[PDB]
A paper describes a structure:
The I’m Not Dead Yet (INDY) protein in Drosophila melanogaster is a homodimeric plasma membrane transporter composed of 590 amino acids, belonging to the family of divalent anion–sodium symporters (DASS). INDY recognizes intermediates from the tricarboxylic acid cycle as substrates, with a preference for the dicarboxylate form of citrate at pH 6, and the anion exchanger inhibitor, DIDS (4,4′-diisothiocyano-2,2′-disulfonic acid stilbene), strongly inhibits its transport activity. Therefore, our biochemical characterization confirmed that INDY is a DIDS-sensitive H+/citrate symporter that predominantly recognizes citrate in its divalent form. Each protomer was divided into two domains: a central scaffold domain (TM 1–4 and 8–10), which plays an indispensable role in stable dimerization of the transporter, and a peripheral transport domain (HP1, HP2, TM 5–7, and TM 11–13) responsible for citrate binding and transport.
Apo-state structures of INDY were determined under two conditions: using nanodiscs at pH 6 and 8. The apo structures occurred in three conformations: (i) outward-open and (ii) inward-open conformations in which the substrate-binding site is exposed to the extracellular and intracellular sides, respectively, and (iii) an asymmetric conformation containing elements of both conformations. At pH 6, INDY exhibits two of these conformations, outward-open (43%) and asymmetric (57%). In the outward-open state, the substrate-binding site is positioned near the extracellular side at the membrane outer leaflet, and F119 adopts an upright orientation with respect to the membrane plane (left). This configuration allows the substrate to access the binding site from the extracellular side, while preventing its release inward (left). In a similar way, in the outward-open state, F119 in the downward position cannot be packed against TM 5b of the transport domain without encountering steric hindrance. The ability of INDY to adopt multiple configurations in the apo state highlights the intrinsic dynamics of the transporter independent of substrate binding.
Numbering used by the authors:
A (entry chain B), B (entry chain A): 33 to 200, 214 to 584
Write the structure that this text describes.
C-alpha cells in the first residue's frame, strides 16, 4: 500500500540513497568522486531530513578517514573551529542576557518606541537587524537578536496578538508569525552582511582574491566604494524581502485569510496596547545592577568585535599581534566574566556597615551553568563543524578543481546570459556549503574566464561574490540559518518554501543593479580596461 | 566578620588568586612563565571549585592568544580533539544502551551472578572494570560501566538497602555508597589501564619513547613481558584500593553506621533478595530486537576498539592505511547506525504479508537526539579539551622543557630515594595534566638522567611510566574522573579526600614490586647492562 511510502519514506531514503548514488563512486576513479558521492548523499539526507541534521553532520567523521581524504584526527579538528567557538559563545552570551530578563526590558522599550503594531514591529526589527549586521558578523547579530524577538513575540502573545507556537519527542511547531519573525531575522542578517566589507567574511574573502589576482587594476574595492555599490541594492532587496515575508506569512496583499490576527490587532492596538505596555514597563522598576552588568558586558563584547581589524582604523588585532587573535577570545571572555562577577554587590555592607540586611550565603553570579547546558542547542556544534569539515574535504579531495573546470565550459554563452547563469550557479553552490568555501571555489575560475573572453573581471566577480552570500533555503547553508532553526525549532520544508522568494528577489535585484548601477559606480565596467588587456596578453 | 569569609570565600579566591599569582608573570620574562601562571591559576580554581570546572576550562581560549602562546584558531581547534570525539561518542553509546533499558538487564544479570551483597558486587564490578580496561581505553571502559553502575545502585535502592542521594538549585549530593561505587569504577579503570601495553595510550607512549632512545636493548617491553611485569602489582594495588574504598566509604574495619547498614542488608540478601531479583529479571520480557541491535552495535564497537592496531596480531587499522583511522570511526559510526537502524522492524510485515498491527507512522530509531542533548554532560567537551589545550600550550610555550630541566637536579639522591621521589613527582604532575603529556615531559628526561648515573634505564622509566597513570585526586587529572564527576555529581572535595588511599597504596605497591619483582621479570635491572654503558659513553 501507499501508506508504506507515506510513513517509512525517511527509512527508504536512508537505505536506498547510498546504493543509488554508489555508481558515481564506482564508475570513476579519483578520490574527487568518492568525496562527491559523500557530499551528494549528505545533501540528500539534509534536504529530506531522513536523519536529524546534527546526526547527518556527524557522517564526515566516518566517511573521510575511510575514503582516505583526510585523517580522522584532522577531520575532528576541522570541527570546533574558531568561528564555531564564536557562535557557541554568542549563544551563551544571549542566554546570559535572557537570564537576567534584560531581553524583556529591551523588548518593552522597543515596543513602546514603535507602537505595538506587529507589521510595524516586524519592519523595525528587520531594518535594525540589517543595519546591525552591516558591521558585525551575521551569526553574532542573529544570536544577539533571537532573545529580543522571543521577548517581543511573548509580549504580543500576552496582548492576545497571536500564538507563538502551534498547540499539540517532536518539539513544538512554530506559528506563521514566529516563522515570519525568525526567518526575517536570519534573512536580514544574511542580506545586511553584504552591504559592507566588514559585514561578512565572504566579502573579505573575494575582495582579497580579486586584489591578489589583479594588481594595478584601476577599479578598487575600497571601503567607501564597496558600500556605495552595495547599499542601494542591499536596501532594495531588504525591503523586498520584508514585503515578501509579510505576504507569505501575514498575507499583506491577501485580505481573504492569515491577516485576520494582524487586522484584529490593528483594530484594538490603538490605546489599550499603549496603556498595557507602559504599565508593564513601569512594573519592571529601575534597572538592577544585574542587568547593568550584563548590558555593560554585552556592549563591551559588541564594540570589542567591531574594533578587530576594521580596515578603516587600527583595530585591537593589529595590536597584540604576537598571535592571530580572532573574535572567539572576547566572547569567551564575556562568558567567563559572567560567572566571575556577582549579581548583588550587597556584601559590601560588611565593610561599609551602611546597609542593614546581610546576604547570609554565597551571592549568586550573573548566570548558572545548569542554565547554559539546558538551553544551548549543542547539536549546532556538529552541524556547523560538519559544514566546515565538508568544505575542507572538498578542498583536499579535489572537488574544488573538478567543479571549477566544469564551470569553464560556459564561455560560449552571451554576456548577460553568462552573468545570470553565474549568479544562479553561485546561489546553487552556496546553498550546500560554507559561503567562504564557495567563494574560494568560484571566484578564480570566474576571473580566468573573464580574462579569456575579454570582460572586465569585476562585472562577473562582484555580482557572483555578493550572490555567494544569498543562502536562504537550508539550515546548513549559512550559520544564521542554523542558529534560527536551533533557537526556535524550524523545519527545513517550510523554511525552503519561504526562502524560494528571497532567492528570486535577490537574484533579480543583484542582476539589475549590477547592469545599471555598477556603471554609475564603475564607469568602465562594460568596456575592457587597459590593465585587463595587459593581464590577458600576459596570460 | 568571620561569616564574611564563611559565605564569600569562593569569589574572594576568584578575585585575589590572579593578583597574588601575578608576580609569577612579572618577575620572570619568558612566555613559559606566563603559561605557568595561567596553569597555576587554573589549578587553584580547579582545586577549590571557585568557578564551575567547565567555565574554568574555557580560560585557555582567552588566555593563550592574549599571552602569545598560540593563535586563537589553533587553541580552539585543540579542543574537541579526536580522543574527545571518542569520549563523547562513548557517552552517546552509553546513552543508547540506557535508552533501551539494557543497563537494567545487565545489572540484574550481574546481581544473579554475585548475589546482591554491596561488598561483593563492588568487588566484582571493580575486577570486571579492571579486566576490561586491561585491553581498552580507560575512558571508554568508564563510559561503558557508568550506566551499569547506575542500574545496580537503582536495583539496590529498590531493595531498600541503601539511598542513592542525600535529601535536598545545585545538583543532588551523592551518598557514601554512590561515591564508593563510582570512584571504584574510575579508579579501577585507571589502575587496570596499566596492566597491558594496550591498556592505555600512556603505555604505548613511554614504550615508544624507550624504544626510540635505546635500541639494541636486550630488555624488551614487548606485549608478553610487559604483562608479566605489570599484572601482579596491578592485582595487588587494585585489591588494596578496593579494601581502602570499603574501609573509607563504608565500615569494613570500623564499627560505624555504614557497617550496620551493610550487615543488615546482607541479612536479607541471602534468599529473599535472590528470589526478588530473579522475579524482577523475569518481569523483563525476552531480550527484544531493540536491545538485540544495541548489543550487536556495542559489541562491534568494542571489538573494533580492541582489534585496531594491536601488537599481538595485525589489526584492521594496518590495512586501510591511506590515513590513520585512530579509533574515532567506530564510535561515531555506532552513533550514526543507532540513528539509522529502526527498532520494531514490524514495518516489514507489508512485504512479508504475515499480518498484525502496522506502525501507522515512522518507526523510531534506537535513540533520539532530545535524549542525547538532555543526558550528555556537554561541559565535558570544554573540561576534557582544556587538558589537551593546556598540554599543547605548555609544550609550545616551553613549560614542559622547563619542568624537565627542573627535574634534573634530583640526581643527588640515592637509588631508592631517587625512585620514590620520581614516583611522587610523577603522581603530583599527572594530578594536574593529561597522562600522555606528563609522560612525554618526564620520560626522556628520566632516560638521560639514568644514563648520567650508572642505573639501568628501565629501573626508572618503567616505574614512573606506570605512575603517570596514577591520578585519583581531581576530575581534571584523568578522563575517567571527569566522566564519573559528570555522570554522578561528585564534588571535587570528596574525590580529593578519597584519592589519598589509592595514591599511597599505588605508590608503595609500585615501590615494593618494582624493587622486588622487576628483578625476577627483568634480571640485571639492578646492574648496568653493556648496551647502557655504550649509550652513556656516547654522550
Ligand atoms: C562499511 C560500510 C557499509 C556498512 C553497512 C552496514 C549494514 C548494517 C545492517 C543493515 C541492516 C538493515 C538493512 C535493510 C533492512 C530492511 C529495510 C527495508 C526498507 C527500509 O528502508 O525501511 C526503513 C528501514 O531502513 C533501514 O533499516 C535502513 C538502515 C540503515 C542502512 C544504511 C546502509 C548504509 C550503507 C553504506 C554503504 C557505503 C559503501 C561505500 C563506503 C524504514 O525505516 P523507518 O522510516 O521506519 O525509520 C527510519 C529511522 N527512524
Ligand atoms: C582582565 C581583567 C579585567 C577587569 C575589568 C574591570 C573589572 C571591574 C570590576 C571588578 C570587581 C570589583 C570589585 C567587586 C567586589 C569584590 C569584593 C571582594 C571579593 C568578593 O566579595 O568575592 C565575590 C565577588 O567577586 C568579585 O566581584 C570578583 C570580580 C572579578 C575579578 C576578576 C579579576 C581579574 C584579574 C585579571 C588580572 C590580569 C592581569 C594581566 C596583567 C563575592 O561573591 P560570592 O563569592 O559570594 O559568590 C560568587 C561570585 N558571585
Amino acid at each position: 500500500c501507499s501508506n508504506f511510502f507515506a510513513n517509512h519514506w525517511k527509512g527508504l531514503v536512508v537505505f536506498l540513497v547510498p546504493l543509488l548514488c554508489l555508481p558515481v563512486m564506482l564508475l570513476n576513479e579519483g578520490a574527487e568522486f568518492r568525496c562527491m558521492y559523500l557530499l551528494l548523499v549528505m545533501a540528500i539526507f539534509w534536504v529530506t531530513e531522513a536523519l536529524p541534521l546534527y546526526v547527518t553532520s556527524m557522517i564526515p567523521i566516518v566517511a573521510f578517514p575511510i575514503m582516505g581524504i583526510m585523517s580522522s584526527d584532522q577531520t575532528c579538528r576541522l570541527y570546533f573551529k574558531d568561528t564555531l567557538v564564536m557562535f557557541m559563545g554568542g549563544i551563551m552570551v544571549a542566554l546570559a542576557v535572557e537570564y537576567c530578563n534584560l531581553h524583556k526590558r529591551l523588548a518593552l522599550r522597543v515596543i513602546q518606541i514603535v507602537g505595538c503594531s506587529p507589521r510595524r514591529l516586524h519592519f523595525g526589527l528587520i531594518m535594525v537587524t540589517m543595519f546591525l549586521s552591516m558591521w558585525i558578523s551575521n551569526a553574532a547579530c542573529t544570536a544577539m537578536m533571537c532573545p529580543i524577538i522571543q521577548a517581543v513575540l511573548e509580549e504580543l502573545q500576552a496582548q492576545g496578538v497571536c500564538k507563538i507556537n502551534h498547540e499539540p519527542d517532536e518539539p513544538p511547531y512554530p506559528t506563521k508569525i514566529t516563522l515570519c519573525y525568525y526567518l526575517g531575522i536570519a534573512y536580514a542578517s544574511s542580506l545586511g552582511g553584504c552591504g559592507t566589507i566588514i559585514g561578512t567574511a565572504t566579502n573579505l574573502t573575494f575582495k582579497g582574491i580579486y586584489e591578489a589576482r589583479f594588481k594595478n587594476s584601476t577599479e578598487q574595492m575600497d571601503f567607501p566604494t564597496f558600500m556605495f555599490y552595495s547599499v542601494p541594492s542591499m536596501l532594495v532587496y531588504t525591503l523586498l524581502t520584508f514585503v515578501f515575508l509579510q505576504w507569505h506569512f501575514m498575507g499583506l496583499w491577501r485580505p481573504k485569510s492569515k491577516e485576520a490576527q494582524e487586522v484584529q490587532r490593528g483594530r484594538e492596538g490603538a490605546d489599550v496596547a499603549k496603556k498595557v505596555i507602559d504599565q508593564r514597563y513601569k512594573d519592571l522598576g529601575p534597572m538592577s545592577i544585574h542587568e547593568i552588568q550584563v548590558m555593560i558586558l554585552f556592549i563591551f563584547m559588541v564594540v570589542m568585535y567591531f574594533t578587530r581589524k576594521p580596515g578603516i582604523f587600527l583595530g585591537w588585532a593589529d595590536l597584540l599581534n604576537s598571535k592571530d587573535i580572532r573574535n572567539s577570545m572576547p566572547t569567551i571572555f564575556v562568558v567567563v566574566m559572567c560567572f566571575m562577577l556577582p549579581a548583588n554587590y550587597a556584601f559590601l555592607r560588611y565593610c561599609t556597615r551602611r546597609g542593614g540586611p546581610v546576604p547570609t550565603g554565597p551571592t549568586p553570579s550573573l548566570i548558572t551553568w545548569k542554565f547554559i547546558q539546558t538551553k544551548v542547542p549543542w547539536g549546532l556544534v556538529f552541524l556547523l563543524g560538519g559544514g566546515f569539515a565538508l568544505a575542507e574535504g572538498s578542498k583536499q579531495s579535489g572537488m574544488a578543481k573538478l567543479i571549477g573546470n566544469a564551470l569553464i565550459g560556459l564561455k560560449v554563452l552571451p554576456n548577460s546570459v553568462l552573468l545570470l547563469v553565474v549568479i544562479l550557479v553561485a546561489v546553487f553552490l552556496t546553498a550546500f556549503s560554507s559561503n567562504v568555501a564557495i567563494a574560494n571555489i568560484i571566484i578564480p575560475v570566474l576571473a580566468e574566464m573573464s580574462l579569456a573572453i575579454e570582460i572586465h573581471p569585476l562585472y562577473l566577480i562582484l555580482p557572483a561574490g555578493l550572490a555567494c552570500s544569498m543562502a536562504f533555503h537550508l539550515p546548513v547553508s549559512t550559520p544564521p540559518n542554523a542558529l534560527v532553526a536551533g533557537y526556535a525549532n524550524i523545519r527545513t520544508k517550510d523554511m525552503a518554501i519561504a526562502g524560494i522568494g528571497p532567492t528570486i528577489i535577490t537574484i533579480i535585484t543583484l542582476f539589475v543593479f549590477c547592469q545599471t548601477w555598477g556603471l554609475v559606480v564603475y564607469p568602465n565596467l562594460n568596456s575592457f580596461p587597459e590593465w585587463a588587456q595587459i593581464y590577458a596578453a600576459a596570460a
